[PDB]
Design a protein around this ligand. Structure first.
Ligand SMILES: [K+]
Ligand SMILES: [K+]
Ligand SMILES: [K+]
Ligand SMILES: [K+]
Ligand SMILES: [Mg+2]
Ligand SMILES: [Mg+2]
Ligand SMILES: [Mg+2]
Ligand SMILES: [Mg+2]
Ligand SMILES: [Mg+2]
Ligand SMILES: [Mg+2]
Ligand SMILES: [Mg+2]
Ligand SMILES: [Mg+2]
Ligand SMILES: [Mg+2]
Ligand SMILES: [Mg+2]
Ligand SMILES: [Mg+2]
Ligand SMILES: [Mg+2]
Ligand SMILES: [Mg+2]
Ligand SMILES: [Mg+2]
Ligand SMILES: [Mg+2]
Ligand SMILES: [Mg+2]
Ligand SMILES: [Mg+2]
Ligand SMILES: [Mg+2]
Ligand SMILES: [Mg+2]
Ligand SMILES: [Mg+2]
Ligand SMILES: [Mg+2]
Ligand SMILES: [Mg+2]
Ligand SMILES: [Mg+2]
Ligand SMILES: [Mg+2]
Ligand SMILES: [Mg+2]
Ligand SMILES: [Mg+2]
Ligand SMILES: [Mg+2]
Ligand SMILES: [Mg+2]
Ligand SMILES: [Mg+2]
Ligand SMILES: [Mg+2]
Ligand SMILES: [Mg+2]
Ligand SMILES: [Mg+2]
Ligand SMILES: [Mg+2]
Ligand SMILES: [Mg+2]
Ligand SMILES: [Mg+2]
Ligand SMILES: [Mg+2]
Ligand SMILES: [Mg+2]
Ligand SMILES: [Mg+2]
Ligand SMILES: [Mg+2]
Ligand SMILES: [Mg+2]
Ligand SMILES: [Mg+2]
Ligand SMILES: [Mg+2]
Ligand SMILES: [Mg+2]
Ligand SMILES: [Mg+2]
Ligand SMILES: [Mg+2]
Ligand SMILES: [Mg+2]
Ligand SMILES: [Mg+2]
Ligand SMILES: [Mg+2]
Ligand SMILES: [Mg+2]
Ligand SMILES: [Mg+2]
Ligand SMILES: [Mg+2]
Ligand SMILES: [Mg+2]
Ligand SMILES: [Mg+2]
Ligand SMILES: [Mg+2]
Ligand SMILES: [Mg+2]
Ligand SMILES: [Mg+2]
Ligand SMILES: [Mg+2]
Ligand SMILES: [Mg+2]
Ligand SMILES: [Mg+2]
Ligand SMILES: [Zn+2]
Lengths: 135, 134, 122, 86, 50, 155, 52, 59
RNA sequence: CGACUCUUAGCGGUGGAUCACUCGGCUCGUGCGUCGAUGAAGAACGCAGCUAGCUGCGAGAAUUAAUGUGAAUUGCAGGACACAUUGAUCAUCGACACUUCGAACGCACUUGCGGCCCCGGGUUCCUCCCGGGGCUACGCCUGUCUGAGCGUCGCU
RNA sequence: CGCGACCUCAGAUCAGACGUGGCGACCCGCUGAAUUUAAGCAUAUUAGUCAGCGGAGGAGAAGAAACUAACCAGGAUUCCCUCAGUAACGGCGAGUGAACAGGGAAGAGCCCAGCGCCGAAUCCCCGCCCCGCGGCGGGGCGCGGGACAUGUGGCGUACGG
RNA sequence: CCAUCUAAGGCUAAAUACCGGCACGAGACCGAUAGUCAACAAGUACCGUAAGGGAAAGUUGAAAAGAACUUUGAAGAGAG
RNA sequence: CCACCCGACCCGUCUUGAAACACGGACCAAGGAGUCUAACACGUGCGCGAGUCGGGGGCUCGCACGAAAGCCGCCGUGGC
RNA sequence: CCGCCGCAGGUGCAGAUCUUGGUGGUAGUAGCAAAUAUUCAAACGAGAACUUUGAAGGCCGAAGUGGAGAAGGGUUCCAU
């Protein structure tokens, strides 16, 4: 999990927020692995990642990276999408398969939290007071 | 009434553009009417005032029929100096008094290649508008 | 005389440098006159010579760079200063040829099912 | 003696001029600037001080290059061309 | 101090050059409102802080 | 504090609502912008209908609205198959296609099949090459009748 | 800025106001009461041919 | 002389040498409190500073 | 009889209210929506004949070229080839130029100390010295070269 | 012994490229309080909000159903009105609180892997020539190099092929 | 039993947002103790080791015509 | 302005009780405090009335005013 | 710049140890009293208790009221 990084386990709040252990990170370890690979190789684009093994202390993932400036990539219309600037650091914005799994996206009764594109988008829409001109 | 949405009617804006206009714009701002004979001759109502132009002062304390030459166009002050439009300082020095070019009438133009080009542009356009009004 | 960039265009490289040298010598003398008393006429010539030097140097640099562009025209690789600047992001965008590339599948769709011009009667 | 007398012993500079932001906040012993965060790669900036943000944001300086980009934008960043000779 | 770096000396150079009164002919210019240098530093009153 | 007789009210104003207040002062500007875009699009696509492609009749679901019909997203593949229109061709000639929709009853299928056939008769098809026409509408039909049909196609 | 600047008026009430305004414009006593200087006007309402 | 702060004694000696076509024995430089670099350029004994000052225009 | 004190008026001061003014804000709206290793944002220092700030600019420094424009700029002065029509000035700006620090890039941050290549000078003919130019950061992609392995094999 | 092939690695100021930092109103991914309300207070509320970190673009994200429904059925996403202060949550206290249908704004659909078949039919780099031609390339050539059977390309994707 | 879709790969304009920026228009707004902190050499002067804090300050006249000259005074300052 | 006769304690505030040995107030100028939004109740005015209401959208060759106004009706979906 | 008919509001001050600016009585008052001490003549000058020169009387008294530095200051140095 994700231990709360507070000094000596003191949270300085109400008991509801006194938790330091048994806490879990919002994103998966596969998402963290993509983020690490993406940060180190800033000139490449994270496409996807897959599991290859685990032990008690470590999980091993293999991240597929694409060089967006290689001619074999830029001259192929099927992969020209990854070369566009809007796809910079997809792994850091939750746009890879592993990253988007934690966002609560989806269709249906289960995924109402993220109507509008994200949990933040839905919250903004539902907490914005629409004051029309004629009221 | 003005209808152009890209032209402002704001008092503060128009004053700001006027008092901070660059010199070449100030040239257009410092236009003066031609005399009746000049207006009839060139079919032009107004010209940007130039040094070595003979003018009459038609408004103010120096109004009269005297023909004087424009000796200095001080655009930064929006005023012109005319050769006999002067006054006596205390110590006896004679200083020109600034006259706004809209308050003078050009009686003789300093014609060179540029003025002749400018005059034939205004008259061609005034005549072309008649081909509109008709 | 009056130094004009127009006149300097046809001059050779050697005499352009020579003109630059005489101007630089003259400016040094004027700066001497600035501290050794010196009349107003000599002081007011400082700006004239200073801008005259810039006029000669601009002609030399403009001539020297355009010769490079003619030499590097048609070469696969050119110095970065001789390359289009624009903005970093426009320099990193797909080129027109790459942007006009279509897969055979897309080409087959366009050939078979082109958009039609049609009207509907009321 | 914590007041006037102790003020006389202040003769060692904690901070000096920063080589990046020019503020006199480069802590000598820590070798870090309390203004811009030098030598950190990223600029020190906090949303808790908007005043501090607007004191040094883009716009309080010269725009030696941006205000040329703003001009060149209005014509589509054209290059390699000149007006027709007269 | 007599011991000084080049950067500090160059900094003190700029501060001396700036600490001068306005030229008297500035006042005669059109639209002038500067009647005296309001950024004059006296070595004993206000310190540079460096 | 309550006072005498009143309604118990729970106004939802305990968050920082003042930070998220959407005013509508650009509503007139938005309406102008949408209008100009509609007009610009119509001029670009003329003489094709301004509203867009023809839509099918669908029955609204639930017991509250099953007595009413409305415009659907697109014609089903079965409706296009019966009408004899290739699903790829339908989009080019202005027919919306919805592969997700399935026809549960034959009454709905025949209603939309008839709608497609009647649309096809009303359609004026310009040749891809003006000089050479193959299976397109008649020159006379194109010359005069063609005009941009405003409003939904066959409401 | 989220003061209530604008106001709604019923369409029927807006239409009633136009009717009352038109009716009053045909009464010389009310037009003159608005200082409209119509002493030499031939008739109220004043109707002119469509070639205008 | 007042010289560029970038210049060193070797450059100052070389500049003075063939600007004024003289020989230089020693160069002593300081940076004055107004940030300028002042160079004391002592010429060779055969050259006369007063003569050179006349040709320059210093006096 | 005066002072002194108080009250009220006239005038004078002290002070900067009031009124009038407004190249400034605030609010709403619209169009666009563009930074950077080809060195940004920011900082420093410097640049004017007289100029400290503001502004502008970068050793070509209160600007060069070009285009448009068409006689100024101006506080003073100076220049009739620096007082210009063979183009003043202003605007535009596409050409050229663009110091130091800064993601900041040889290393270090003291204008501290190197390395490699080329050119000129020291009569250079070596070493060495001086000047000038180019290069020398981290990560990463494709490709090349040079290699490592009692990793897996083949032949002898 | 050695000579070769491959694999896994390493060095280079190797040839050519790419990332960094800024701005941050709006957007995406995390992290995340307490003041406050509850007339005390701990769950709750404040609030997934402020502060903190990362990443973008002119928009972003979302997006062509492992959907809604239970009807005579609709049919990607986003936004608006309504649903609705409702169903529901809640020391069932204070408080909190969506969705589907309906009406609109806009409207647009698609691609792989796999499974097969086609003599790798595919791609990158280099050298030369010809033509448009500020490097954008088109073609031709080369018993040129490399990638690639640990699988490139054509066809094809749940609407079937 | 029935309904409904086909997850664990990917792309995609529009309608939407925009207290930063580049230009621009407007206002039943404020009118120099107001309106931005800032109408002015304002994020300036100044303060703090520092993070940071942070002002005051508009108006001659239509035009400088900004009071030559005489006179008292050392002058500031007066009288003409 | 002054004289005289009679009357006459300093205001604001909290308080059962203030001229108080209760607190604030040296003086003068300018600034200075029930607002706006949403909701709800009742009362009053106006329109229409078993209905009523377009507020969201659209149409009118957008645009000084006009970001207004007018219109919709198989736009009344929807609210009540 | 105002009257009248309507419209709109950041709309009325004596107080808030109110905010900012200005000004009084106090008041020509308190004070200009830590470390022994000044005097004569002349000069310059409009002007001398205080400047300069000379003379006298004193003090620091080598752990200095002397002569040089570090830190810090940053031109304060020197001349006019
Ligand atoms: K020119
Ligand atoms: K009280
Ligand atoms: K009291
Ligand atoms: K010292
Ligand atoms: Mg806490
Ligand atoms: Mg979380
Ligand atoms: Mg996107
Ligand atoms: Mg996507
Ligand atoms: Mg959802
Ligand atoms: Mg809400
Ligand atoms: Mg205004
Ligand atoms: Mg394919
Ligand atoms: Mg203490
Ligand atoms: Mg320390
Ligand atoms: Mg001190
Ligand atoms: Mg539509
Ligand atoms: Mg030295
Ligand atoms: Mg008075
Ligand atoms: Mg006064
Ligand atoms: Mg020029
Ligand atoms: Mg050191
Ligand atoms: Mg290399
Ligand atoms: Mg970044
Ligand atoms: Mg904005
Ligand atoms: Mg409580
Ligand atoms: Mg309480
Ligand atoms: Mg408590
Ligand atoms: Mg929360
Ligand atoms: Mg935050
Ligand atoms: Mg961008
Ligand atoms: Mg979009
Ligand atoms: Mg699908
Ligand atoms: Mg839906
Ligand atoms: Mg309800
Ligand atoms: Mg629960
Ligand atoms: Mg909540
Ligand atoms: Mg719905
Ligand atoms: Mg395949
Ligand atoms: Mg795709
Ligand atoms: Mg005032
Ligand atoms: Mg103010
Ligand atoms: Mg203020
Ligand atoms: Mg009591
Ligand atoms: Mg009382
Ligand atoms: Mg008592
Ligand atoms: Mg009390
Ligand atoms: Mg008191
Ligand atoms: Mg008041
Ligand atoms: Mg009522
Ligand atoms: Mg109605
Ligand atoms: Mg308007
Ligand atoms: Mg309307
Ligand atoms: Mg109803
Ligand atoms: Mg209904
Ligand atoms: Mg008001
Ligand atoms: Mg008030
Ligand atoms: Mg008061
Ligand atoms: Mg009161
Ligand atoms: Mg006394
Ligand atoms: Mg005493
Ligand atoms: Mg003693
Ligand atoms: Mg003694
Ligand atoms: Mg002793
Ligand atoms: Zn710093």
């Amino acid at each position: 999990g994700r231990k709360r990084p507070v000094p000596k386990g003191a949270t300085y709040g109400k008991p509801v927020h006194h938790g330091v252990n048994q806490l879990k990170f919002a994103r998966s370890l596969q998402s963290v692995a993509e983020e690490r690979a993406g940060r180190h190789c800033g000139a490449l684009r994270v496409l996807n990642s897959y599991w290859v093994g685990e032990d008690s202390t470590y999980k091993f993932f293999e991240v597929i990276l694409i060089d967006p400036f290689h001619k074999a990539i830029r001259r192929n219309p099927d992969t020209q999408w990854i070369t566009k600037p809007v796809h910079k650091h997809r792994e850091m914005r939750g746009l890879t398969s592993a990253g988007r799994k934690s966002r609560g996206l989806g269709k249906g009764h289960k995924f109402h939290h993220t109507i509008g594109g994200s949990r933040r988008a839905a919250w903004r829409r539902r907490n914005t007071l629409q004051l029309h001109r004629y009221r | 009434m003005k209808f152009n949405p890209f032209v402002t009617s704001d008092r503060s804006k128009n004053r700001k553009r006027h008092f901070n206009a660059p010199s070449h714009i100030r040239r257009k701002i410092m236009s003066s009417p031609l005399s009746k004979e000049l207006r009839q001759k060139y079919n032009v109502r107004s010209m940007p005032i130039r040094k070595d132009d003979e003018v009459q002062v038609v408004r103010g304390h120096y109004k009269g029929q005297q023909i004087g030459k424009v000796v200095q166009v001080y655009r930064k002050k929006y005023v012109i100096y005319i050769e006999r439009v002067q006054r006596e300082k205390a110590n006896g020095t004679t200083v020109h008094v600034g006259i706004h070019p809209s308050k003078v009438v050009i009686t003789r133009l300093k014609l060179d290649k540029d003025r002749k080009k400018i005059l034939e542009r205004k008259a061609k356009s005034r005549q072309v508008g008649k081909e509109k009004g008709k | 005389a009056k130094i004009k960039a127009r006149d300097l265009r046809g001059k050779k490289k050697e005499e352009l440098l020579k003109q630059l040298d005489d101007l630089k010598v003259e400016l040094s003398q004027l700066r001497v006159a600035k501290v050794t008393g010196g009349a107003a006429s000599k002081l007011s010539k400082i700006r004239v010579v200073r801008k005259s030097i810039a006029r000669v140097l601009t002609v030399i640099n403009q001539t020297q760079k355009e010769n490079l562009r003619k030499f590097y025209k048609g070469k696969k690789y050119k110095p970065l200063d001789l390359r289009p600047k624009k903005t970093r992001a426009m320099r990193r965008r797909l080129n027109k040829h790459e942007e006009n590339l279509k897969t055979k599948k897309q080409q087959r769709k366009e050939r078979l099912y082109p958009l039609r011009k049609y009207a509907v009667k009321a | 003696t914590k007041g006037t007398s102790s003020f006389g012993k202040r003769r060692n500079k904690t901070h000096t001029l920063c080589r990046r932001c020019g503020s006199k906040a480069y802590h000598l012993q820590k070798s870090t600037c309390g203004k811009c965060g030098y030598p950190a790669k990223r600029k020190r900036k906090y949303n808790w001080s908007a005043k501090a943000k607007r004191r040094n944001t883009t716009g309080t300086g010269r725009m030696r290059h941006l205000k040329i980009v703003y001009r060149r934008f209005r014509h589509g960043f054209r290059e390699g061309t000149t007006p027709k000779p007269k | 101090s007599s011991h000084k770096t080049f950067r500090i000396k160059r900094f003190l150079a700029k501060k001396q050059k700036q600490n001068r009164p306005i030229p008297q002919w500035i006042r005669m210019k059109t639209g002038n409102k500067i009647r005296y240098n309001s950024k004059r530093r006296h070595w004993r009153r206000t310190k540079l802080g460096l | 504090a309550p006072s005498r007789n009143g309604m118990v009210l729970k106004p939802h104003f305990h968050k920082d609502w003042q930070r998220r207040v959407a005013t509508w002062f650009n509503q007139p500007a938005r309406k102008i912008r949408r209008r100009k875009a509609r007009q610009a699009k119509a001029r670009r696509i003329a003489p094709r209908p301004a509203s867009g492609p023809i839509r099918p009749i669908v029955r609204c679901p639930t017991v509250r609205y099953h007595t009413k019909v409305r415009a659907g997203r697109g014609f089903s593949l079965e409706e296009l198959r019966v009408a004899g229109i290739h699903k790829k061709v339908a989009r080019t000639i202005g027919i919306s296609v919805d592969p997700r929709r399935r026809n549960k009853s034959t009454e709905s299928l025949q209603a939309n099949v008839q709608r497609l056939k009647e649309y096809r008769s009303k359609l004026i098809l310009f040749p891809r090459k003006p000089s050479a026409p193959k299976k397109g509408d008649s020159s006379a039909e194109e010359l005069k009748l063609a005009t941009q049909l405003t409003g939904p196609v066959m409401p | 800025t989220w003061r209530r600047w604008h106001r709604r008026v019923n369409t029927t009430q807006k239409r009633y106001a136009i009717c009352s305004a038109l009716a009053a414009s045909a009464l010389p006593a009310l037009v003159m009461s608005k200082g409209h200087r119509i002493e030499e006007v031939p008739e109220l309402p004043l109707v002119v041919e469509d070639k205008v | 002389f007042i010289v560029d702060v970038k210049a060193n004694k070797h450059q100052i000696k070389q500049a003075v040498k063939k600007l004024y076509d003289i020989d230089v024995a020693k160069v002593n430089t300081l940076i004055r409190p107004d940030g300028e670099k002042k160079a004391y350029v002592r010429l060779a004994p055969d050259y006369d500073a007063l003569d050179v000052a006349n040709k320059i225009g210093i006096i």
